C-alpha cells in the first residue's frame, strides 16, 4: 500500500486510506507510515480519508525531500499539489508537531483544521538513552525483540510502554494496562506504536535529523495559525511535556485545549476518557464535510 508521490519538492512516500474529507496524518520521532496508520484508524472509521506520510529520513522518503520543519511543511504542500488537493485537515502527534505547525503557519490556505496531540511546539532537547533501553530502542536486535514481544507477550509490551510514556504510579500503570487489554483497538494501537519507537535501521536518518532540528528551533510562529485547532495533552505525559501544549494553545487564537487527567503520551488513543476527544477531533477535521 505505500505509494511514492513525486512532488516539486522531491519524492515522498505515503499511504492513502479511507474515504471522506482528507486529513494529512503526521507521525512522531521516530515513526513512519506504520505509526501513522495506527494514528489514522479512528479517522477512517469516522468516514474521513487519511494521507499518511513517511517524513523525510524515514523508510522510503529521502531526507533530501525536506530536512527542516519548514522544508517538511513545504513538502506537504507540494504533496497536496501533487494530489490535486486544495486543502486538508492535519493530525499530528509528538515529533510531527513542528512540520505540521509550520504548514499551518506558513500555508494557512492549505490547512482546514489542526488536531495537535502532545506535539513539540518549540525548541526541544532529547535526553539520550542509556544501557538496556538504548540497545532496545537503538539497534536491529532491539527492533526484533520489540516485534517478538508485540507478537507473543503483548501485555508485557503494553505495560512497558505505558510506564515509559508517563509519570504514573505502578498502580495507575496497571489500571491503564488492564483497560487496554480489554479494548482490542487500544491494544493494537499500543503494540504498533511500541514497535515504531525503535529508531534503528530505516528510521535512523529521520530520527537523528529530527533530534538535531528540534534542538535548533528558533520559533515555529504558532501565533500565525488561523485554523480551527484542538490541542490534546495527557497530564502525566513524560515524553512531550504538557507545557508544550499549553504554550501551543496560548499562541493559536481560538484554539481549544483538552487535558486528559493521568494521561500518558498515548492518551488521545488509550486513555479511558479519550473516546469523546477522538470524536471531537474527527468532527473538527471534517471541516464542514
Cell 492518551 found at: 267
- 102 vs 276: CA distance, rounded Å: 27
* Interface with Cl ion (CB under 5 A): 263-264, 267, 270-271
Instruction: State how beta strands 10-18 and 49-53 pair.
Output: antiparallel
- Distances in whole angstroms, Cα of residue 116 to Cα of each of 35, 163, 222, 280: 15, 22, 12, 13
Q: Least distance to Cl ion from the beta carbon of 172, Å?
A: 9
d(CA 119, CA 101): 9
Residue 245 contacts residue 93 (beta carbons within 8 Å): no
Site string for Na ion, 14-53 (x = CB under 5 A): ----------------------------------------
Residue 186 Cβ vs Cl ion, minimum distance, rounded to whole Å = 9
Which is nearer to Cl ion, 6 or 169 (by Cβ)? Answer: 169
| Binding range to Na ion, per CB under 5 A, among 25-33, 122-130, 156-164, 255-263 | 156-164
Residues 217, 124 contacting (CB under 8 angstroms): yes
Q: Which three cell numbers, joined as nine digits, stand for 258?
A: 483538552
Beta-carbon contacts of 104 under 8 Å, excluding residues fewer than 6 positions away, are 90, 111, 114, 222, 224, 225, 227, 229
Q: Is 163 in the site for Na ion (CB under 5 A)?
A: yes
The contact pattern for Na ion, residues 185-224, with x = CB under 5 A and - = no contact, is: ----------------------------------------
Residue 213 contacts which entry, Cl ion, Na ion, none (Cβ below 5-8 A, type-dependent): none
- Least distance from Cl ion to the Cβ atom of residue 81, Å: 37
Residue 227 binding partner per list Na ion, Cl ion, none, with a CB distance cut-off of 5 to 8 Å that depends on partner kind: none
Q: Which residue has its beta carbon closest to Na ion?
A: 163
Q: How far is the CB of 162 from Na ion (least distance, A)?
A: 8
Q: Which residues bind Na ion (CB under 5 A)?
A: 163
Amino acid at each position: 500500500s505505500v505509494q511514492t508521490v513525486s512532488t516539486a519538492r522531491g519524492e515522498v512516500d505515503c499511504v492513502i486510506v479511507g474515504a471522506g474529507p482528507p486529513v494529512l496524518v503526521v507521525h512522531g520521532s521516530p515513526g513512519g507510515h506504520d505509526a501513522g496508520l495506527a494514528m489514522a484508524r479512528f479517522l477512517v472509521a469516522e468516514g474521513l480519508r487519511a494521507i499518511v506520510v513517511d517524513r523525510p529520513g524515514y523508510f522510503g522518503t529521502p531526507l533530501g525531500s525536506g530536512v527542516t520543519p519548514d522544508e517538511q511543511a513545504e513538502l506537504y504542500a507540494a504533496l497536496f499539489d501533487a494530489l490535486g488537493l486544495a486543502a486538508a485537515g492535519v493530525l499530528c502527534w509528538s515529533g510531527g508537531g513542528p512540520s505540521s505547525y509550520r504548514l499551518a503557519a506558513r500555508h494557512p490556505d492549505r490547512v482546514r483544521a489542526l488536531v495537535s496531540v502532545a506535539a513539540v511546539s518549540h525548541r526541544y532537547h532529547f535526553d539520550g538513552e542509556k544501557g538496556a533501553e538504548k540497545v532496545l530502542m537503538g539497534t536491529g536486535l532491539g527492533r526484533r525483540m520489540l516485534q517478538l514481544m508485540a507478537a507473543h507477550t503483548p501485555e508485557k509490551l503494553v505495560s512497558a510502554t505505558i510506564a515509559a510514556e508517563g509519570h504514573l504510579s505502578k498502580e495507575h500503570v496497571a489500571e491503564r494496562v488492564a483497560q487496554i487489554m480489554a479494548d482490542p483497538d487500544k491494544e493494537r494501537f499500543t503494540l504498533e506504536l511500541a514497535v515504531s519507537a525503535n529508531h534503528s535501521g530505516p528510521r535512523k536518518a529521520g530520527f537523528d535529523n529530527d533530534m538535531d532540528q528540534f534542538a535548533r528551533i528558533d520559533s515555529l510562529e504558532l501565533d500565525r495559525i488561523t485554523a480551527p485547532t484542538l490541542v490534546v495533552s495527557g497530564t502525566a505525559d513524560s515524553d512531550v511535556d504538557p507545557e508544550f501544549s499549553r504554550f501551543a494553545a496560548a499562541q493559536i487564537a481560538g484554539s481549544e485545549l483538552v487535558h486528559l487527567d493521568a494521561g500518558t503520551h498515548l492518551a488521545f488513543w488509550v486513555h479511558p476518557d479519550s473516546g469523546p476527544v477522538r470524536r471531537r477531533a474527527a468532527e473538527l477535521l471534517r471541516a464542514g464535510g
